[PDB]
Structures are given as C-alpha cells and as structure tokens.
Amino acid sequence: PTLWSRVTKFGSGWGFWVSPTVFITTTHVIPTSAKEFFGEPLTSIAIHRAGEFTLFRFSKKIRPDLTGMILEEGCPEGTVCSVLIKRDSGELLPLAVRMGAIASMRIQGRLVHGQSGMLLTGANAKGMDLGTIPGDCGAPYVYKRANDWVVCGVHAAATKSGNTVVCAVQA
Amino acid sequence: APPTLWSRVTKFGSGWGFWVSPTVFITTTHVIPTSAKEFFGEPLTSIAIHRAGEFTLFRFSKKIRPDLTGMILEEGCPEGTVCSVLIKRDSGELLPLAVRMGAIASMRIQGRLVHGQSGMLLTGANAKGMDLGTIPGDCGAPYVYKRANDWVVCGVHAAATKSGNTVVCAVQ
Amino acid sequence: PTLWSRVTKFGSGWGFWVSPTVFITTTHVIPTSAKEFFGEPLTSIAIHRAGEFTLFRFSKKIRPDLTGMILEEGCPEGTVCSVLIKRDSGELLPLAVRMGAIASMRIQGRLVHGQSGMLLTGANAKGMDLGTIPGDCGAPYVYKRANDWVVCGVHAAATKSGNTVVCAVQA
Amino acid sequence: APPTLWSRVTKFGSGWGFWVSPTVFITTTHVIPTSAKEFFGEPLTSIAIHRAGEFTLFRFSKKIRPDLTGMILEEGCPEGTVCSVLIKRDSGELLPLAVRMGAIASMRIQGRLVHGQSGMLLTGANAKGMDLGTIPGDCGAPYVYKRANDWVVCGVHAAATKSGNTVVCAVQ
Ligand SMILES: O=C(O)c1ccccc1OC(F)(F)F
Ligand SMILES: O=C(O)c1ccccc1OC(F)(F)F
C-alpha cells in the first residue's frame, strides 16, 4: 500500500520497482561485478540500458505484493514531479521539482543527458536537507495524473547550487 | 534533521508532542486525551498548563527528560522561511516534510475553525495522501528550521486542507 | 487581441474588463467622491460589492472591442495564477502565484479576507521589481484552462517580505 | 528595471540588441541581417566582430552611444539567480519577464540545435503566448539582474520551447 515500498537500496544508490518483474535505476550506480541480483542469476535478467537510464526485467516475480504502474519517457514540460529520496538515516524526503526540456547539460564538469528540472525549495540546500546529495542517485521521479501515479525517470545528477537536477529517461 | 531533534518527538494521545527541554513538552490541544489526570508519572496538580487555542505547553516540576538540552521555541517563523515538519510514520520511518511558511491566518478546515501560521507543502503538486502529505495522525508534530548554527522550533501541526497543499502550524 | 488591454488604471490602483459591460476592482482603490465612471453616470451602473471585491455592470458597452471571459469565485488550491501588474512606468509585470486556501489573514497589521497565494519569485522582492507594491492593488488573477483564460479575483494586499499575497474573490 | 537599461535596447534585424558601452553592442547571431555591409554609419571594415555560436559582440572604432556609461557583461549568471529579460512589445510597452537561471545546456528546439544558459519563466503555468511568454520577435533581448548596488548583463535571448516554459540565453 505505499510508493515508498518500491524504493530499494541498490549499488552505490537506489532503484524502483515499477512492477513485480521490472526494476529501474541510474546506470552509474549499478555494480560492475555481479552474478545475481535479488537472488536471481543475471542469466535470467533482461538488461535494457539507454544512457543513464537502466531497466531490468526478471523472469520470476521478485515483488509479487506490487501491481504494475505506468512508466513514461519523461513528462510534459512544466509538470511538477516528486523525487522519492530515501536516506541511510531512515529519512524519507519527497521534494517537488518543476520539469523542463530534454537537454545535455554539463553538471559540475560532467556531460549528462536527460530531462532538467528545478527544486521548489530554492533555499538551495547546503546541509539542512532540502536538496539532493550524490548518494541519492537512482531515486524515481513520480507525479499523480487522474487516479494513477506515473513514474517518468530516475535521479542522475545535480548542480553544486542544488537548484538544477537531471532525471534520466526511457529512450 | 539531527537525531537529537527526532528524539524530542513523543507519541501522545491521537498524535504527537515535542520536548523543548527536560521540563517543557508542547503539543496540539485537540490530541490531548480529555479524561487524563496524570502525565509521565506526575498528576495534573504538579504540572503548569498554558493553552492558547490549538497550542498547549506543559511545564513539569521535575526533569522528565534529563537527556535533553533546552532549545529555542519562537512564536512562529518569518514569512518565506522553509520549515521541516518532523513526522514519524509506520516502521521507524522519518518524514521531514518541507513547508514554505506564510502569514498568521484564520481558516475553516473541513467544518472546523483554525488559527495559526499558514504554509504550503514543497513535496509535490497534489500532496493529497500519506506519501507526499499529512494525515490526521500527524497532529502535534513540531515545525523546525536550521539557522546559521542553530535549529529552532516555532509551532506544532494543527490542520491541513482537503487538497493537501495548505497546512496550519499553531503558535505560542 | 490582448489580456493586457483589459487592465485599466482606476482610483488609487487598477481594475479589469471581464466583458464590454463588466469591470472588476479592489474595493479600497475605488474613488469615494464620484458622479460618473468612464463617461457613464453612476445612475446607470449596478455596483455589487463583497468585502475587498467589487463588480460594476454598465448599462451600455464601454469596451465593445472585447468578448466576455469566464469569471470564477477563486480557483482550486494549488492552481498557479498570473497577477497582471501594470506600472505607471509603462512596465507590464506578469508574476506566477501558487494559490492556497480562503482565509482571514492579518497582513502588516490589517485583517484581509480572500484566497492566499505565494509568489514563485521567492527572491522576495525588495526593489528589483519581482514583487508587488501598494500601487498594484486591483490587478487581476488569471490562468489558462483548456482553451480559455479564467479570471478569479483582484490583488487586495501583500506582506512586507513579499512572499504572501491575498486575491479578493466573488462571494 | 531602470530607464538607462531600457535605453540600451535597440531594434536590430529580426529582433533586438543591447549597448554595453558607447562602443560595444551585443545581440543574437540569427537576428543579424545576412547581407548587411554597414552598421550605425560604420562599414564592416571599421567594426571588430566576435562570434561564439548564437552570441555576437560588435566593437565600433567610434562612440556610437556617448550618452551611455560602460556596464559589466558577465559569461552568464550563477545557477538560481533570477533574471529579467528586457522585452519591448507593441505600443511602448516594457515587458521584463522574470526567469530563474540554471545550467549551461545544449538542446534541440523545434528542429534547430541551441547552446547556452537554460532558465524557466516565473510569469505563469503555461507561458505559451505573447501575454506571459516570449515570441520569435524577442530574440536578442538582454538578460540582466540587480546586485547589492549594481545591475549586470549576462546574455541575450536565443530560443524558447514550444511549451513556453524553458528559455535559452546565449553567453559570452
Ligand atoms: O525516559 C523514558 O522512560 C523514555 C523512554 C523511551 C522514550 C521516551 C522516554 O522519555 C519519556 F518520554 F519521558 F518517557
Ligand atoms: O543616437 C541616435 O541617433 C539614436 C536615436 C534614437 C535611438 C537610438 C539612437 O542611438 C543609436 F542607436 F546609436 F542610433
């Protein structure tokens, strides 16, 4: 009965269960030495990568407690999403982000491609929480539309200021 | 928010309260159990109650929480200050909901008349629900913000609109 | 062909032409000594006041160049409106405001009733423009909905900070 | 924005340009008339052109605008800075559109590849239109912001998305 339930610690960051068999994450957090994930051998896992966005489809239900949600290739410009950040502290941190255009976007010295957005906290977090930290990568971008939650990508990067974030998206 | 702030948040009646010092506990008036004659081992006799509408402050005659340092409680915060509401949810999960504070207001929220410092949640578009917004069970949860050095507490969770987006913090 | 066209200097502030015969303004800006407005005698003008919101209906078309727009009693909580500020300088200043609840709201020492909102400029204007000044009262609150512009009230007050505004609304 | 800043905004080709000093005029590359051999009485011969994609700077050999003081032009602004875009519209109307600036970006805007400092308009929800947003005619309009004492200029209007909400400022 909760979206928070779907946000799972993974590699150097997090990922998100879209359904009992589909898990999405940020490509840079995935382990580079692995034979199995969540007790299924890589043998049995379809991997689909598109830049900083990776989708895994398992051959058996890993989370049969979940129903399948809508996944979309980003959202309409001006949509206000929630980035669902979990911290190792036990803290849950849903932050509002106004989404902008698809772009390639030089984020502290790095070329990153995805949908840009700006945190509504503007306070421009520098250790009060209120913004993202490197450890948060792979957290999902969701919003409510009619009666349904939509997930439209995963957290790939953020600028020192904290104002600008990049959501990696399905191709 | 630091653990010593989470530490001050106590389960109380139909919601929560917050330890400002070893002898001072604050909460929302409507969560206080109406028939209670004793709190933390002390009878009403031994407790100073100060009530102003939906804000209630208890001062005990002995240190109930000697592990704590006295903190700054202020009468709300400056307009435009972004606060965290320290909400505990099922399973030792900590939910510090970001809120932009505005004006001292009076409102009718679902039949009932409410007075305090209004704010708007910064967690999502329609914050209607337990995942992005408040629930009745969160009443009494403290509003807090970090200054240059400090954290300060400025009120307790009293109400939210059917939409989710607007909250009311009751104030000293 | 422009919404800006409908924003007309008036008394100590402004008002807005909803149609050729209907003009809305903030009650406190209206002149307290008058026999005619826009060349029609008060004789011929229906006045409807509700607190800080006043509607005038003329007996003849004053602005027959305009079509009639939708007027609504405030908007849904979380709607992002535009306050259409005109300055005596010639400047046009559309500012985004996220609307909140109907409330009575003590704004620098004054009881004002209407829909509260917060300026997205957050910078909290103190002489860069980016916020309202007393002279701006009566400016309309509009937003786009399907193919139609909606007007849902007029600017009645703002806090020193600049963050909080009150939109006066139809009863 | 002060009148001495509005004063610097000149009608130029398919849009606008801006006088940084008596001898320095900046604009968006794509508004420059392609067949022009003379500007403000001077032939190309006598003008220093510096071009970096969609930003063009002209330095003349004589004071074209001796009424002006030299101003600070910077290579864009810090992330989170709120700028004004100094747009002139039909009838001596002045439209300083509020924009929150973000990251140096590369985008495809309606078939065409664009590079500069991205921002989001603060004028309304869907800024699609001339009343809340930009139009093709606004290209070259300067981006400016007020500091403690100063105003600074940090780029010129190069592009906007079909939605309205995202703009691109080309930078030195
Ligand atoms: O001191 C205790 O017994 C205690 C134990 C767990 C949690 C809170 C406590 O403090 C108090 F609220 F005062 F009871
Ligand atoms: O100095 C002038 O002739 C002048 C007159 C009106 C507007 C701009 C002007 O400056 C210049 F752009 F340089 F032409």
Side-chain angles (χ1 to χ4, degrees), chain D residues 7 9-11 19 25 40 64-67:
Chain D
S7 200
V9 176
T10 293
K11 195 188 195 43
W19 288 103
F25 185 67
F40 303 102
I64 312 302
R65 289 284 312 260
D67 50 306

Side-chain angles (χ1 to χ4, degrees), chain C residues 1-4 80-82 84 86 89-96 120-123 127-130 149, chain D residues 1-2 6 82-84 89 92-98 100 122-126 128 130-132 146 151:
Chain C
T2 180
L3 279 180
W4 283 109
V80 178
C81 289
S82 289
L84 302 195
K86 288 194 172 172
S89 61
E91 289 196 333
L92 310 175
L93 194 61
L95 294 186
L120 309 202
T121 40
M128 331 82 103
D129 92 55
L130 297 183
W149 293 94
Chain D
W6 289 108
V82 172
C83 284
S84 301
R89 286 302 178 73
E93 274 169 342
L94 313 180
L95 189 65
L97 291 181
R100 192 156 283 135
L122 297 173
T123 71
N126 174 55
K128 176 68 172 268
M130 58 155 268
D131 291 324
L132 299 190
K146 195 204 145 152
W151 290 81

